[PDB]
Structures are given as C-alpha cells and as structure tokens.
Amino acid sequence: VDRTADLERARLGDDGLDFQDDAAQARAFAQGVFLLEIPEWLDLSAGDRFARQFFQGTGVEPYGKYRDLSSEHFGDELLGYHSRVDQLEQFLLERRFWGEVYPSEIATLGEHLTLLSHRVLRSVLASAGIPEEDWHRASGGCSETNGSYHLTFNHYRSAHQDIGLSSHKDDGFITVLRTTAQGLEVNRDDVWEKVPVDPACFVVNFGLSMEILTSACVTPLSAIMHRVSHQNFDRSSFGHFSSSRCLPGADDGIYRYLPSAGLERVCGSRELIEENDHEIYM
Ligand SMILES: CC[C@H](C)[C@@H]1NC(=O)[C@@]2(NC1=O)OC[C@](C)(O)[C@@H]2O
Ligand SMILES: O=C(O)CCC(=O)C(=O)O
Ligand SMILES: [Cl-]
Numbered sequence: 001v002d003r004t005a006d007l008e009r010a011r012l013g014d015d016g017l018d019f020q021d022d023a024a025q026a027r028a029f030a031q032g033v034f035l036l037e038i039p040e041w042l043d044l045s046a047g048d049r050f051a052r053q054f055f056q057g058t059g060v061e062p063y064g065k066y067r068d069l070s071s072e073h074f075g076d077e078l079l080g081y082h083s084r085v086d087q088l089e090q091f092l093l094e095r096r097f098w099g100e101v102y103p104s105e106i107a108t109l110g111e112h113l114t115l116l117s118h119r120v121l122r123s124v125l126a127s128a129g130i131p132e133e134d135w136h137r138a139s140g141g142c143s144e145t146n147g148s149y150h151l152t153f154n155h156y157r158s159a160h161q162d163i164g165l166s167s168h169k170d171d172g173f174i175t176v177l178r179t180t181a182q183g184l185e186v187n188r189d190d191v192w193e194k195v196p197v198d199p200a201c202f203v204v205n206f207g208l209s210m211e212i213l214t215s216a217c218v219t220p221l222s223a224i225m226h227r228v229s230h231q232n233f234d235r236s237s238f239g240h241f242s243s244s245r246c247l248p249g250a251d252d253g254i255y256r257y258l259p260s261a262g263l264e265r266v267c268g269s270r271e272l273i274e275e276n277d278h279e280i281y282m
C-alpha cells in the first residue's frame with residue numbers, strides 16, 4: 001500500500017482532549033484512530049529498550065530475561081511471553097503484576113500510561129452522551145482506575161515469512177500505541193493506508209469494547225481495523241491496552257449503551273478477548 005492516512009492530532013490539555021476544532025474531533029472519533037502528542041515530561045526510553053530486548057533471553061541486560069516468563073508463571077494464559085503465528089512475538093502483562101514482576105521503571109511507565117489513557121477515555125465517554133453515573137459499569141472500571149490494563153511489548157521477527165501482525169481490531173476500549181517505525185496500516189473506508197510515523201505522538205485507537213458500547217448511539221464509534229505489514233528488517237513497539245476488568249473469576253462484563261434506557265450486557269471481557277484472539281491468529 002502506498003497511501004498514507006491523514007490522521008487528526010490531539011493533545012491532552014486543561015479540559016481533556018484538545019483537537020484543532022470540533023469537526024476534527026468528530027472525524028477522529030468517527031475514524032477510531034488519531035495521533036496524541038506525548039507529554040514532554042514522559043520518558044519512553046526504558047519502554048523502547050524493553051521492546052527491543054524482552055525476547056532475547058537472560059544473556060541480555062537488563063530486560064532479555066523476560067523471554068523466560070511464560071503464561072504458566074501467572075496463572076493466566078494471556079500473560080507472559082508469547083510467540084505468535086505472524087512475525088510478532090509479545091510480552092503481555094496486566095497491571096496487577098506490574099509492581100511485582102516488571103522492572104520498577106517499566107511499572108512506572110505503565111502507571112503514567114494508565115492515567116493518560118483514563119483521561120483520554122473520559123473525554124470520549126463525554127462525547128458519546130452516556131450519563132456519567134453509568135461510566136464505571138459501561139467501561140468495566142476504565143472510566144476510573146479499576147479496569148484491566150495490559151502493558152504489552154511487541155517485536156517483529158523479520159526472518160519469519162509471515163505478515164507482521166494480521167488484520168484485527170483490539171479487544172478493549174482504548175489502546176495507546178507507542179510506535180517509532182513504519183509498518184502499521186489502517187483500514188478506514190475499505191482501503192488500507194499507512195499510519196504516518198511520528199515518534200512525538202502516540203497512536204490512539206478504539207477497540208471492540210468501544211464499538212460495542214457505542215453501537216446504538218447517534219454517532220457510533222468504530223474499532224479501527226489495523227495490521228502490521230511484513231517486515232524486512234526487525235521492528236518493535238509497545239502499547240497500553242485498557243479493557244473491562246477481566247481477571248480470572250472477577251470479570252466486569254461488556255455492555256452496550258441503550259440511549260434513554262441504560263446498559264445491557266453483551267458478553268464477558270475475557271470471553272471477548274478469547275473470541276477475538278481466535279478470530280485474529282486464525
Ligand atoms: C490479553 C490481551 C490484552 C487484553 C490486550 N489486547 C489486545 O488486543 C492485544 N494485546 C493486549 O495487550 O492482544 C492481542 C493482540 C492483537 O496481539 C494485541 O496486542
Ligand atoms: O506494532 C504495532 O504497531 C501494532 C501492534 C498492535 O496492533 C497490537 O499489539 O494490537
Ligand atoms: Cl494536561
């Protein structure tokens with residue numbers, strides 16, 4: 001693909017998300033993807049280094065050892081190191097383990113991104129016309145700080161003859177993606193387009209839970225279809241993912257908002273992730 005998407009750029013300011021104007025904000029939310037300026041005080045260098053190292057094993061300091069932590073170590077099949085069928089290999093960790101398992105500076109990064117994402121999500125919920133007292137249940141806790149949050153590190157193995165990462169929608173409400181190299185593509189309006197590279201911005205997009213939640217609103221919001229093209233050289237990235245609380249045995253559920261009525265349950269949060277990962281990776 002040779003077309004490059006023209007995305008709207010936003011900033012977090014005194015009143016929440018600031019786009020250039022109300023029309024720009026509407027286009028961004030209608031597309032389900034936009035750029036978000038990275039706060040100047042926020043240090044991403046340890047996260048960038050973790051994404052470059054996590055897969056390399058205990059010979060490589062300080063982060064290569066996370067290659068050896070599989071899902072078995074967490075009692076949760078979703079977490080730890082995972083080789084995917086595509087070029088991608090990942091390390092995924094939910095917030096309840098960050099303080100104990102991640103390096104301290106990586107847990108700190110995760111916490112910063114959680115509070116940034118929280119602020120982004122609340123701006124979106126307000127634009128959707130959902131009553132504020134329904135936000136906590138509608139977002140499975142992400143309208144406050146009680147959601148499930150995964151800080152997930154990605155490395156694309158260019159020696160594998162696969163697509164980088166198959167076409168998919170994310171599971172949750174908000175993904176804050178840190179990417180510094182080409183490869184991410186988005187499908188708005190049934191044409192694949194490259195996401196412009198800008199290491200001064202995150203890429204923000206909505207997941208399936210945002211789409212389900214707002215599907216009956218006057219302006220439904222989409223979970224952007226996106227992929228990573230086959231990489232001829234290595235690539236890395238990381239993202240902060242916000243989902244309805246999906247702990248084993250403590251699942252907040254996924255809801256659709258019915259204007260003038262309230263929230264109706266659609267499915268489980270973990271169930272949605274499992275069904276989505278099935279539909280993606282085959
Ligand atoms: C347990 C997953 C968690 C809810 C979150 N959501 C996701 O969609 C993602 N990663 C995450 O960290 O999992 C699958 C994926 C397409 O590779 C993407 O990277
Ligand atoms: O690496 C990227 O740019 C995208 C990663 C992604 O889409 C995901 O982890 O769900
Ligand atoms: Cl601010």
Ligand SMILES: [Cl-]
Pocket residue numbers: 182183184229230231
């Ligand atoms: Cl590329």
Ligand SMILES: [Fe+2]
Pocket residue numbers: 168169170226
């Ligand atoms: Fe994604």
